[PDB]
Amino acid sequence: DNRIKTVVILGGGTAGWMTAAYLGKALQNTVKIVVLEAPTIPRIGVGEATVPNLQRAFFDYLGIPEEEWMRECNASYKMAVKFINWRTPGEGSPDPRTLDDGHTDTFHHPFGLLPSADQIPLSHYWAAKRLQGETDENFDEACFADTAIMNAKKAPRFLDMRRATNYAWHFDASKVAAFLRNFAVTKQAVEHVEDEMTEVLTDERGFITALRTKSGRILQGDLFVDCSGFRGLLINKAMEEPFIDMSDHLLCNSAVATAVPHDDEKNGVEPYTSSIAMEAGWTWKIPMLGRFGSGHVYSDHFATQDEATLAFSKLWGLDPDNTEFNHVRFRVGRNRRAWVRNCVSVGLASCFVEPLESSGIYFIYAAIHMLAKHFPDKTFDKVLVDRFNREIEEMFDDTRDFLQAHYYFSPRVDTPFWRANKELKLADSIKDKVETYRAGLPVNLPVTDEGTYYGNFEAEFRNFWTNGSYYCIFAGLGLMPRNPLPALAYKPQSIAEAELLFADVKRKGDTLVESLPSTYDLLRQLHG
Amino acid sequence: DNRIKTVVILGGGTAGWMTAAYLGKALQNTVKIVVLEAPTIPRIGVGEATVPNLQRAFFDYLGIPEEEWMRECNASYKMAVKFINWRTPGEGSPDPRTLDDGHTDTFHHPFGLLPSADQIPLSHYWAAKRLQGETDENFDEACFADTAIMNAKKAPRFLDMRRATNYAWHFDASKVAAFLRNFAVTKQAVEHVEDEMTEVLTDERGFITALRTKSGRILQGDLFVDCSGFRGLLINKAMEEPFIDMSDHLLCNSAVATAVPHDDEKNGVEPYTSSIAMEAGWTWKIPMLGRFGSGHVYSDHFATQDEATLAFSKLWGLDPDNTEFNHVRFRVGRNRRAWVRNCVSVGLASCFVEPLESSGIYFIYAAIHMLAKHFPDKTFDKVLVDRFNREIEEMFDDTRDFLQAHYYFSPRVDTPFWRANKELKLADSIKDKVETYRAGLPVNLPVTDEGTNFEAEFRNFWTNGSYYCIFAGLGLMPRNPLPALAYKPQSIAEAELLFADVKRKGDTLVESLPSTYDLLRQLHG
Ligand SMILES: Cc1cc2nc3c(=O)[nH]c(=O)nc-3n(C[C@H](O)[C@H](O)[C@H](O)COP(=O)(O)OP(=O)(O)OC[C@H]3O[C@@H](n4cnc5c(N)ncnc54)[C@H](O)[C@@H]3O)c2cc1C
Numbered sequence A: 001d002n003r004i005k006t007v008v009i010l011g012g013g014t015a016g017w018m019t020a021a022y023l024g025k026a027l028q029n030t031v032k033i034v035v036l037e038a039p040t041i042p043r044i045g046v047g048e049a050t051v052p053n054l055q056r057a058f059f060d061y062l063g064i065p066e067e068e069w070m071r072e073c074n075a076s077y078k079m080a081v082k083f084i085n086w087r088t089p090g091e092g093s094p095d096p097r098t099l100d101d102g103h104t105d106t107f108h109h110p111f112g113l114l115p116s117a118d119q120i121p122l123s124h125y126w127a128a129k130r131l132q133g134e135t136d137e138n139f140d141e142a143c144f145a146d147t148a149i150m151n152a153k154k155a156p157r158f159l160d161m162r163r164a165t166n167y168a169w170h171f172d173a174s175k176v177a178a179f180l181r182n183f184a185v186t187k188q189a190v191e192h193v194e195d196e197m198t199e200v201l202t203d204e205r206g207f208i209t210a211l212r213t214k215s216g217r218i219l220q221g222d223l224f225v226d227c228s229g230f231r232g233l234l235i236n237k238a239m240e241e242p243f244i245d246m247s248d249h250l251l252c253n254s255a256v257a258t259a260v261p262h263d264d265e266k267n268g269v270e271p272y273t274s275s276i277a278m279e280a281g282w283t284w285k286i287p288m289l290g291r292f293g294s295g296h297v298y299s300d301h302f303a304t305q306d307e308a309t310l311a312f313s314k315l316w317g318l319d320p321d322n323t324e325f326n327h328v329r330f331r332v333g334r335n336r337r338a339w340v341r342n343c344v345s346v347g348l349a350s351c352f353v354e355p356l357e358s359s360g361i362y363f364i365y366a367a368i369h370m371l372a373k374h375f376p377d378k379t380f381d382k383v384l385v386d387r388f389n390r391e392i393e394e395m396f397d398d399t400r401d402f403l404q405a406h407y408y409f410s411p412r413v414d415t416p417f418w419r420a421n422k423e424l425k426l427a428d429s430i431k432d433k434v435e436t437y438r439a440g441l442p443v444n445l446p447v448t449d450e451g452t453y454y455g456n457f458e459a460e461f462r463n464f465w466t467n468g469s470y471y472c473i474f475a476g477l478g479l480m481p482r483n484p485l486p487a488l489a490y491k492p493q494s495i496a497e498a499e500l501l502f503a504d505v506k507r508k509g510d511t512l513v514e515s516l517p518s519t520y521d522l523l524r525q526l527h528g
Numbered sequence B: 001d002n003r004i005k006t007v008v009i010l011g012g013g014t015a016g017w018m019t020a021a022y023l024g025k026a027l028q029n030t031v032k033i034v035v036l037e038a039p040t041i042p043r044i045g046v047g048e049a050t051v052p053n054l055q056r057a058f059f060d061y062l063g064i065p066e067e068e069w070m071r072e073c074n075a076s077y078k079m080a081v082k083f084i085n086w087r088t089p090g091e092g093s094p095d096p097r098t099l100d101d102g103h104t105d106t107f108h109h110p111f112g113l114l115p116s117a118d119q120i121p122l123s124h125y126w127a128a129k130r131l132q133g134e135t136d137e138n139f140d141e142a143c144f145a146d147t148a149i150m151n152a153k154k155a156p157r158f159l160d161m162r163r164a165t166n167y168a169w170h171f172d173a174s175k176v177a178a179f180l181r182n183f184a185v186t187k188q189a190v191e192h193v194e195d196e197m198t199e200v201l202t203d204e205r206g207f208i209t210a211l212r213t214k215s216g217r218i219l220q221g222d223l224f225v226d227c228s229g230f231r232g233l234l235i236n237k238a239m240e241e242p243f244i245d246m247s248d249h250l251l252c253n254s255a256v257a258t259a260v261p262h263d264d265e266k267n268g269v270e271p272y273t274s275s276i277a278m279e280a281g282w283t284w285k286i287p288m289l290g291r292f293g294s295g296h297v298y299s300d301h302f303a304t305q306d307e308a309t310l311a312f313s314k315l316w317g318l319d320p321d322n323t324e325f326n327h328v329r330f331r332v333g334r335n336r337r338a339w340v341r342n343c344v345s346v347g348l349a350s351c352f353v354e355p356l357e358s359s360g361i362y363f364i365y366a367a368i369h370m371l372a373k374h375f376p377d378k379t380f381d382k383v384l385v386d387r388f389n390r391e392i393e394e395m396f397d398d399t400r401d402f403l404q405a406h407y408y409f410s411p412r413v414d415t416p417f418w419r420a421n422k423e424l425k426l427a428d429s430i431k432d433k434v435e436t437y438r439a440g441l442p443v444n445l446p447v448t449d450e451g452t453n454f455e456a457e458f459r460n461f462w463t464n465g466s467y468y469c470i471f472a473g474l475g476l477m478p479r480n481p482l483p484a485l486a487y488k489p490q491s492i493a494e495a496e497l498l499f500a501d502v503k504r505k506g507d508t509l510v511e512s513l514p515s516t517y518d519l520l521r522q523l524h525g
């Protein structure tokens, strides 16, 4: 018996309690699990966004049904991230400005895979038409019915809870952490120790043997999960693993956030996250029932905390001296290695990027999934650790590259921030992908039906940013292929097939924008 | 109108006629297609085994249903490649030798994809039991009902044609090329020109403009497909593109082949390809109705042509001086680039590896699929050509590295051939994959029911199950089980029901299925 007997998880919040819960189920009560978290000085619920795999891959694995957790964390629905004013210059504003060509400066990044005709994705058929003047429709409205639905602020389920489209979740992070702590302690025999860590005890090889708490108590274990946040108390401090700062790729490194009460009966609820462009960065809007979480993400090299706070308060008509603000100064990048010896970093202690494409919780889920799959015995095979490291390296870097694209291919150059983005070098992987897009070829072509994509995580993980996500962002910012896909010139029967799929998206959007309840109405059913 | 108007295809083998037919349908009669083949310069005349995606990724695109083409080219079923005597020393023989551990030296590489429990494929649950002396079963018989079925020589369909398992196809190459020529000419308005090519006409930029025939005829076109075989009359000769010799990775570079008539009433028909190991290489056996195709693949650096021919004749009880033999001297590797300017290499002109895992025709439909997707206009965008080149590079490498595995991890050391195999330079890709397998981790985990689509099975075609079939078949095992299994007793238990399900299915189906012979006699009746 050479197995791990005890796992110690430093830190609660979302990372620690997702880790505790997933491992509880994965390790089938053959391993003792201890969470050590300091006492929680509660901080205002700024809202967090998720991706659609979360219910299948996490809550369903734990047997927690969707309604049960949503009702305990004031959860709303999310059908896309909506980008507002990313192409036009000037101060932030909730309202979209107007382009030269007369279009409103908004584009959606919805969920799901694009349909195909003669194995060519709908993206390419729309591009042909748009380059050739045959259409004035935007990519998002042409190719996703969800675009029509989000414009009408309708819900992604009918009131009897039949599904209409794909969706993910908005919620208060700390309420989810609490729902999960309580799940893990009552139903999974996790030991909750509320205290500070003061010492990390290590052997001759530098493997951790226990953590000392402030009350003097010593927690022995065989594997340690650093969920300590940015401080990286195990992975960076004790293990001495270097962080790789990646501000050479993204410039934002601060936020100022808050909750804003909201007339849900007057305005309706948006079933989506909004990325509202500002002078020195951007601002999230995450609708929940009653309120919305918002935060101005900025660079401190292009705005002071004051400059940012004023601009952010101006946005929403808030009083700066009578408004409760959280001020984060995050690090952007990842550990050289996520897992050193017997210390596995998960969450902010592992890696971070601005929450521009709802990456935070997915990064946590991806790591714990990958920890369960590569779970070690006490010999800590170096290949096991290496492969875990490789999965996290690629997951992170590919998503950094994807985020850089949002900035490098913004046409905005008014403020020194937006111009500064154009002076960064693009990574080789994303240059190669732009070269491909520009010749009209698909990038990251989905090779699987949506059922398998959102059913089997391993399938989604091999192809997280698909063709449709590249087209949503490139075409949304106004980068287009140089020309259509040449094969379309030879395929009039295929062009015609695509015209029926464009029709099918119109029919669905029309039919559903009529029959669906408002987002507000579904929430009011759910939480009452 | 900046589009290609005319496409000329040099060579009317399996490559040429697959190309003509696919493009006919893909290009929707907007483009004139010409095949130029000399009926006197024979096709290589081999190309007999296939992989299971052939029907989806080709005949379904053409709207030809499976029965229609099988009945016209004397097709049999294939449920695996069966490796005979790959672990034991001495002269070739159709009959399997006996291992030290007392079992016969045979392992299968079947196609039927592996069930999972708690997201871990059945491969890993078998490996746990075998490494912990808790099972005596080999991987193939534990994890695939196909193994039971091939041992009983039963068919992979019932007589009412309901499917039993996954499978690929055996057939006569020349009958397929004929059924395809005739499809392409009658239903797709392709022009068949029976004549020899004598000169390749080129502009100042080095693009081909036409091909000159011996009868003085000039075939103009804007895009050329070199299906000329190993000669590479357009891609290598005219375009001056170098072939990248890869005998640093595989040592076989010759074959000697023939058909053997076969008592199908006496023996039954084997629903599988046999890879029978020899002293200086190996020998394929490819059952069809009435006959079986065979050929000794060898290195000429470790056997002379006579050495090989004698050994091959010995195998089957053939008379060397009164038996009709085909003698190929193939090249192993790929063009530095498959597509140069306006010349696209497809088939033996593009790339090749020994027919150990029936990769030849898959390479053809992969390339044509990729040509249709990257099809150019007259501007010949450099990015389009580069990406086409990249997909052929990776397709090839993925299959080469998989093949190298069969050799580097053979335990045989009797003849200087088998010992030479242990001095191969392994590619980085296959070293990394062995390192992974050895830690007990899955290699190229399939993420899908086989419900899912040609595109699905293409950059990592060779799945977990295929690596386990070969590694574990030759006796390379993980160092230890997958550690996560130590913590998952409920999962271990679930797997015990899947092992039971493969037993029940093999038993139930070895009873209820018709013999391979009997299904063929219904099909070709
Ligand atoms: C030993 C061996 C075993 C194989 N086994 C398998 C297997 O089991 N399974 C599998 O899937 N694949 C296998 N393959 C690969 C497969 O056989 C081929 O991919 C396919 O059958 C034919 O390739 P091709 O048509 O490119 O070439 P070829 O058949 O060589 O075609 C050459 C063509 O060029 C024409 N030509 C040449 N010069 C001229 C000219 N001047 N004018 C006009 N025409 C000209 C010839 O007339 C002919 O039509 C094997 C290959 C070899 C060598």
Ligand SMILES: Nc1ncnc2c1ncn2[C@@H]1O[C@H](COP(=O)(O)O)[C@@H](O)[C@H]1O
Residues within 6 Å of the ligand: A010, A011, A012, A013, A036, A037, A038, A039, A040, A195, A196, A197, A198, A227, A228, A229, A230, A231, A233, A348
């Ligand atoms: N020294 C520590 N001892 C115990 N818990 C800690 C320590 N440092 C951070 N944490 C916990 O780590 C989690 C993430 O911290 P933060 O990112 O600052 O919210 C919280 O639950 C903290 O209480």
Ligand SMILES: N[C@@H](Cc1c[nH]c2ccccc12)C(=O)O
Residues within 6 Å of the ligand: A050, A051, A052, A053, A080, A081, A109, A110, A111, A112, A113, A357, A358, A460, A463, A464, A465, A466, A469
């Ligand atoms: N694989 C993700 C990709 C995605 C699409 N739209 C998004 C919006 C935000 C975050 C991720 C996404 C999904 O389909 O769910």
